[PDB]
Amino acid sequence: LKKTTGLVGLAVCDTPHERLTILYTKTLDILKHFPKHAAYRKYTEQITNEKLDMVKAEPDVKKLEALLQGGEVEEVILQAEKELSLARKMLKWKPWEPLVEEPPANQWKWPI
Amino acid sequence: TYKYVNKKEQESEVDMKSATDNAARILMWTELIRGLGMTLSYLFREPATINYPFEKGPLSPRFRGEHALRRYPSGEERCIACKLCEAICPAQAITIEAEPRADGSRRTTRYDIDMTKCIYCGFCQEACPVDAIVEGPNFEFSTETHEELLYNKEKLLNNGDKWEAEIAANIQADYLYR
Amino acid sequence: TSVKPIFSRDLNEAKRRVRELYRAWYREVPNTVHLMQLDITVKQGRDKVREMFMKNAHVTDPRVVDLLVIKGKMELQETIKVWKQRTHVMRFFHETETPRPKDFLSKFYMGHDP
Amino acid sequence: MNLYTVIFINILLSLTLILVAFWLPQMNLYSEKANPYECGFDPTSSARLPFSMKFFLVAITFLLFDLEIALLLPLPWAIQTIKTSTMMIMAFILVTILSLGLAYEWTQKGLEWTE
Amino acid sequence: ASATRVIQKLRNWASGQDLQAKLQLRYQEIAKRTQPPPKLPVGPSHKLSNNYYCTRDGRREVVPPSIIMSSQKALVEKKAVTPAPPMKRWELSKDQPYL
Amino acid sequence: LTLDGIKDRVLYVLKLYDKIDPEKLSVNSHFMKDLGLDSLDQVEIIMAMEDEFGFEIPDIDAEKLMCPQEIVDYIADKK
Amino acid sequence: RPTVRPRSDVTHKQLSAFGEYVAEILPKYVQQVQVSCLDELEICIHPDGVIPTLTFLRDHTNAQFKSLADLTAVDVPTRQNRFEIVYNLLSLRFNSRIRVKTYADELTPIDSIVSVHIAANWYEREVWDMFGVFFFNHPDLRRILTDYGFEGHPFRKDFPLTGYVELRYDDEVKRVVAEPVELAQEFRKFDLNSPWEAFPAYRQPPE
Ligand code: SF4
Ligand code: SF4
Numbered sequence: 013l014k015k016t017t018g019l020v021g022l023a024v025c026d027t028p029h030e031r032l033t034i035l036y037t038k039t040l041d042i043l044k045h046f047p048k049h050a051a052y053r054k055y056t057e058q059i060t061n062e063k064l065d066m067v068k069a070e071p072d073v074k075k076l077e078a079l080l081q082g083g084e085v086e087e088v089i090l091q092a093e094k095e096l097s098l099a100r101k102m103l104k105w106k107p108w109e110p111l112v113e114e115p116p117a118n119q120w121k122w123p124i
Numbered sequence: 125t126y127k128y129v130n131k132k133e134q135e136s137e138v139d140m141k142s143a144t145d146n147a148a149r150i151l152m153w154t155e156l157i158r159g160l161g162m163t164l165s166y167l168f169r170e171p172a173t174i175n176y177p178f179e180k181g182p183l184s185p186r187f188r189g190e191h192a193l194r195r196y197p198s199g200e201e202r203c204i205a206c207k208l209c210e211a212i213c214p215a216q217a218i219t220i221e222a223e224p225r226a227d228g229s230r231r232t233t234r235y236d237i238d239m240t241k242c243i244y245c246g247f248c249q250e251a252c253p254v255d256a257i258v259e260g261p262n263f264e265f266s267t268e269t270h271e272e273l274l275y276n277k278e279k280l281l282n283n284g285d286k287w288e289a290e291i292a293a294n295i296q297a298d299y300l301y302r
Numbered sequence: 303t304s305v306k307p308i309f310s311r312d313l314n315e316a317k318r319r320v321r322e323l324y325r326a327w328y329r330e331v332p333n334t335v336h337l338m339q340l341d342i343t344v345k346q347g348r349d350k351v352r353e354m355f356m357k358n359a360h361v362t363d364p365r366v367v368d369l370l371v372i373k374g375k376m377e378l379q380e381t382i383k384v385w386k387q388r389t390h391v392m393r394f395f396h397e398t399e400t401p402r403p404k405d406f407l408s409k410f411y412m413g414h415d416p
Numbered sequence: 417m418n419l420y421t422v423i424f425i426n427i428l429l430s431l432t433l434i435l436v437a438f439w440l441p442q443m444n445l446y447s448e449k450a451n452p453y454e455c456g457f458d459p460t461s462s463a464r465l466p467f468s469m470k471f472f473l474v475a476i477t478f479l480l481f482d483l484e485i486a487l488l489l490p491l492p493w494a495i496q497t498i499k500t501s502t503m504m505i506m507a508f509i510l511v512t513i514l515s516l517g518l519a520y521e522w523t524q525k526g527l528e529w530t531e
Numbered sequence: 532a533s534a535t536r537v538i539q540k541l542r543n544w545a546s547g548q549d550l551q552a553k554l555q556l557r558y559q560e561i562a563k564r565t566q567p568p569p570k571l572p573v574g575p576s577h578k579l580s581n582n583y584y585c586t587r588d589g590r591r592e593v594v595p596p597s598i599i600m601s602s603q604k605a606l607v608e609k610k611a612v613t614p615a616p617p618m619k620r621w622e623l624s625k626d627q628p629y630l
Numbered sequence: 631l632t633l634d635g636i637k638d639r640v641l642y643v644l645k646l647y648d649k650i651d652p653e654k655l656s657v658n659s660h661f662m663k664d665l666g667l668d669s670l671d672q673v674e675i676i677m678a679m680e681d682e683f684g685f686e687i688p689d690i691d692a693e694k695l696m697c698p699q700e701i702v703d704y705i706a707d708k709k
Numbered sequence: 710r711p712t713v714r715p716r717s718d719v720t721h722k723q724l725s726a727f728g729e730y731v732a733e734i735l736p737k738y739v740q741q742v743q744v745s746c747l748d749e750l751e752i753c754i755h756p757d758g759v760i761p762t763l764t765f766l767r768d769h770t771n772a773q774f775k776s777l778a779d780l781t782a783v784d785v786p787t788r789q790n791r792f793e794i795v796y797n798l799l800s801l802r803f804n805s806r807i808r809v810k811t812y813a814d815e816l817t818p819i820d821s822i823v824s825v826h827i828a829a830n831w832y833e834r835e836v837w838d839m840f841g842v843f844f845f846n847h848p849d850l851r852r853i854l855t856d857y858g859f860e861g862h863p864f865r866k867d868f869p870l871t872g873y874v875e876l877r878y879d880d881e882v883k884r885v886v887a888e889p890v891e892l893a894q895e896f897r898k899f900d901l902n903s904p905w906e907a908f909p910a911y912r913q914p915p916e
Contacts (some may be wrong), residue, residue, distance in 0.1 A: 046619035051733045081617045094768035109737045116789045125624040133630045165546035303860045365816040376851045382462045390858040398886045587715035599728040599742040613771045614727040614805035
């Protein structure tokens with residue numbers, strides 16, 4: 013029903029509920045491979061679960077956008093797939109590990 | 125708030141009269157004729173050009189022009205060799221070598237201002253505590269050599285003696301703001 | 303002791319990169335002299351390239367050798383293009399300035415400089 | 417003879433003007449002055465390399481349309497003919513097939529500057 | 532301003548807009564170049580009393596930045612947070628939406 | 631594999647190097663030991679061989695190449 | 710007090726909470742998190758985690774900092790790693806700004822973030838040109854602001870203000886030639902430091 017997104021290069025992307033649904037479920041499924049103590053896993057599961065809950069709760073596009081507060085629903089879709097890409101990259105990395113190296117003692121001392 | 129500059133609200137559909145209007149706009153070059161009329165009106169307006177060397181452009185008493193060293197009404201030089209104008213000079217364009225005079229007064233022996241280095245910012249004249257250095261209204265002082273723009277104390281005092289009838293009036297008109 | 307390399311584990315592959323860069327400069331000198339209308343000959347330019355490599359040829363740190371190779375590649379790239387001009391490529395020769403003599407008598411005759 | 421004299425007078429006038437332009441002022445020629453311009457830098461290329469124009473099909477079509485022009489130009493004497501019906505039909509057919517060729521090229525994107 | 536009526540009519544018709552009302556040459560409506568002298572006000576902290584500098588010394592209110600976590604000083608269920616609440620969408624202008 | 635042609639063209643390059651060989655070369659003469667050269671002169675010789683034979687010698691085998699004899703046998707087993 | 714700024718403890722608390730959030734999400738790289746009294750959040754990380762930290766901040770759902778405002782370097786030539794590389798990032802979704810710091814020396818390069826933000830191309834070219842900090846995997850890393858044959862990195866603290874060479878036209882060679890610098894004025898340094906301390910809050914403990 014929406015004619016344009018208003019942002020150049022952002023397609024109209026009809027049936028956004030199914031697309032958001034599959035993106036959020038893929039994000040959850042790839043978050044299941046993270047360690048249980050991973051703070052990224054815990055927080056991203058919280059974010060994805062609450063956004064999936066509100067996308068299942070609200071069937072109207074305008075009211076769903078008002079609830080999500082992430083701009084247009086196409087912006088929300090783009091952010092969801094970028095979060096999925098970040099989840100893959102953070103599975104390839106292992107940021108939950110301890111600090112790789114302490115800095116020197118005067119590295120972050122200002123003023124000198 | 126915000127507004128759109130090129131987005132249109134709905135459409136005006138297709139109509140024979142609107143189609144004929146658009147066709148006449150395309151074929152008869154109506155916006156081109158309109159631009160022709162606009163520049164024709166500008167042709168029949170009065171130009172804003174002033175006759176330059178006889179009618180000068182308007183200015184203000186705050187105007188920063190050519191530097192000058194002023195004097196008291198007794199004729200004594202105002203400068204007291206305190207060097208804070210060259211301390212504040214952002215281009216380091218001033219050199220203020222100084223020594224006690226024959227009567228023991230604190231005066232300058234070398235006061236050089238490099239006008240090719242100066243950025244004409246007025247920080248010296250707003251820093252001077254005795255209103256000695258000023259930036260008077262002279263701007264038509266272009267020279268044919270680089271050396272003539274390397275002023276010394278004699279040149280600056282000559283400019284102060286030349287332009288005092290105007291500099292004093294400008295400072296009178298301006299000093300309550302500063 | 304226990305530093306992080308940037309390209310080369312040790313001096314051997316650093317010297318390999320140096321040789322590759324020197325080959326590239328040696329090949330590019332005739333094209334530079336032909337394209338930019340240089341007064342010099344091909345022999346003079348190749349001798350200048352050898353002189354620059356020799357004046358950098360006393361360092362035994364692999365990271366420093368790699369950084370010198372990188373900067374030489376950048377200089378070679380802007381010489382491959384005509385980003386550098388005749389003035390830029392003739393700045394290597396110092397044709398105008400007189401060199402300061404290396405003897406104590408001359409450095410005593412002029413200036414208070416060591 | 418008259419037109420010949422006027423042509424030669426104009427040619428001699430242009431030659432006189434450029435000879436005055438070349439022998440009047442003072443010359444000071446050196447290499448950096450007479451180098452090619454290139455916006456204040458040395459040119460990378462020799463300005464004689466291939467240029468690769470993008471409207472080559474339009475140029476060939478211009479050749480064909482110029483010869484169609486040459487065909488169409490004797491019309492002011494053609495309309496003085498005694499038949500005028502075959503003349504009118506022939507002119508209509510010629511203009512129509514020229515327009516059909518232009519329309520076919522436009523449809524096949526010939527005049528679209530393929531990069 | 533010194534133009535005939537016929538030329539003014541021609542200019543207005545050719546421009547499509549009234550030009551004598553907003554002509555771009557300044558004649559007399561500008562301020563006089565000689566102005567009466569001003570009397571600029573003094574700001575606050577000219578009070579001669581209850582005006583100690585230590586009570587309005589904003590330059591020395593600056594503190595070093597507070598360390599949240601440190602790899603040296605600290606040597607180290609809850610909800611996910613954001614750097615700020617998400618920005619509310621702009622409203623379309625009412626005087627001229629021009630949409 | 632035209633061994634004599636490879637050998638005397640390599641010797642032609644070495645003679646027309648204009649830095650070395652005042653009747654001092656041999657087929658088994660070392661560059662660093664006998665000719666008194668270094669790595670930059672050696673890679674100049676290698677580039678001269680490339681410019682004369684029309685094929686590229688990489689750096690991995692040029693650095694183990696030491697004498698005109700290994701030049702001629704390397705060119706032979708390459709061709 | 711009409712001469713002192715307001716404080717906004719609410720946004721100070723918000724930035725502190727988000728600093729805790731990022732520091733616990735990325736403990737492998739985050740070395741320090743601080744919030745200034747000007748309400749600016751700085752996260753000082755190990756140089757190995759520049760790519761993961763910048764990717765997390767580019768596209769995390771709660772941390773959309775998709776716009777890179779600034780990428781600069783600060784030469785502090787008294788620490789062991791003398792260059793502090795600073796990224797200023799902007800969040801249009803949450804209307805916030807974050808600052809990410811890492812360190813380098815003259816022989817320790819940092820991975821470029823051109824794959825994350827494309828403005829980092831020219832910004833890292835400027836950092837390399839002005840400080841000599843090399844960047845790994847940078848497409849066409851080269852000088853951007855210095856002269857073509859320029860030697861040295863002029864924004865370093867040990868580089869002179871006037872440089873080492875100057876240009877003049879020479880009529881014998883008909884060129885613009887470079888000479889060792891000789892000033893006719895000799896820029897006068899001013900010792901504008903009061904011998905009395907101005908801010909007791911920053912008084913360092915004695916050695
Ligand atoms: S106007 Fe500014 S730059 Fe010029 S002499 Fe005064 S202080 Fe220096
Ligand atoms: S001109 Fe004024 S500020 Fe400068 S040294 Fe003299 S008294 Fe001081």
